[PDB]
From a paper:
[name] (for mini Singlet Oxygen Generator)1 is a 106 amino acid flavin-binding protein that generates 1O2 under exposure to blue light. It was originally developed by Shu and coworkers for correlative light and electron microscopy (CLEM) as it both fluoresces and catalyzes the photo-oxidation of diaminobenzidine (DAB), providing high-resolution images. Novel applications are being actively developed since. [name] was engineered from the LOV2 (Light, Oxygen and Voltage) domain of [name] phototropin 21. The absence of a structure of [name] so far had prevented to rationalize these observations, which we have attempted here using a combined structural and photophysical approach.
Blue-light (440 nm) irradiation of a [name] crystal at 10 W·cm−2 led to a five-fold decrease of the fluorescence signal over a 30 min course and was gentle enough to keep diffraction around 2.0 Å resolution while affecting a sufficient fraction of molecules so that structural alterations could be visualized in electron density maps. A difference Fourier map calculated from non-irradiated and irradiated parts of a crystal revealed the loss of electron density all along the ribityl tail of the FMN, strongly suggesting its cleavage. Indeed, the 2Fobs − Fcalc electron density map of blue-light irradiated [name] reveals the unambiguous oxidation of three surface residues during irradiation. Tyr73 has been partially converted to a γ-peroxotyrosine. The loss of electron density on Trp81 is compatible with the formation of N-formylkynurenine (NFK), a well-known tryptophan oxidation product. Finally, His85 can be modeled by either a singly, or a doubly oxidized histidine, namely 2-oxo-histidine and 2,4-dioxo-histidine. Oxidation of Tyr73, His85 and Trp81 eliminates potential quenchers of 3miniSOG*, thereby decreasing the value of kp. Prolonged irradiation to blue light leads to several structural alterations of [name], which include photodegradation of FMN into LC and oxidation of the quenching side chains. Formation of LC liberates the access of molecular oxygen to the alloxazine ring and reduces protein quenching of the triplet state, while oxidized electron-rich side chains cannot quench the triplet state of the chromophore. All this results in an increase of Φ∆ when photoconverted [name] is excited at the wavelengths where the formed LC absorbs.
Author numbering: 1 to 109
Write the structure that this text describes.
Amino acid sequence: MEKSFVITDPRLPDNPIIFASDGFLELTEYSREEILGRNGRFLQGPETDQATVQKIRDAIRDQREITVQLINYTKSGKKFXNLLHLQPMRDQKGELQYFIGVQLDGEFI
Ligand SMILES: Cc1cc2nc3c(=O)[nH]c(=O)nc-3n(C[C@H](O)[C@H](O)[C@H](O)COP(=O)(O)O)c2cc1C
Ligand SMILES: [Cl-]
Ligand SMILES: [Mg+2]
């Protein structure tokens, strides 16, 4: 599959997605119109582990890189195990500019 990633802007309210790769559209079944401007949490559902979601919150708070695995859902409701890579990206002034989130689909341990 093509590379699945989104880029968020934490200088906007609730860190919305401002770019979604074609691979992300493919992986999640959503259209670019249905993704842009929302927080990445929209992929979570009932089976998503809340301890892992907390770990994500904390990494985003402390602006630190993290890799977690967690259950997400496609538009039509299919489960998929998301090995999610989050990385802060700072400008040359050392100010947080974006977050990049890269998803790999599958059961990875
Ligand atoms: C760039 C980026 C990509 C993200 N991608 C995903 C994702 O693919 N799946 C997911 O469940 N959460 C993803 N998140 C996590 C949620 O956006 C959110 O940070 C997490 O649920 C914790 O915050 P909350 O407790 O307010 O929901 C991503 C966050 C960022 C910054
Ligand atoms: Cl967030
Ligand atoms: Mg939540």
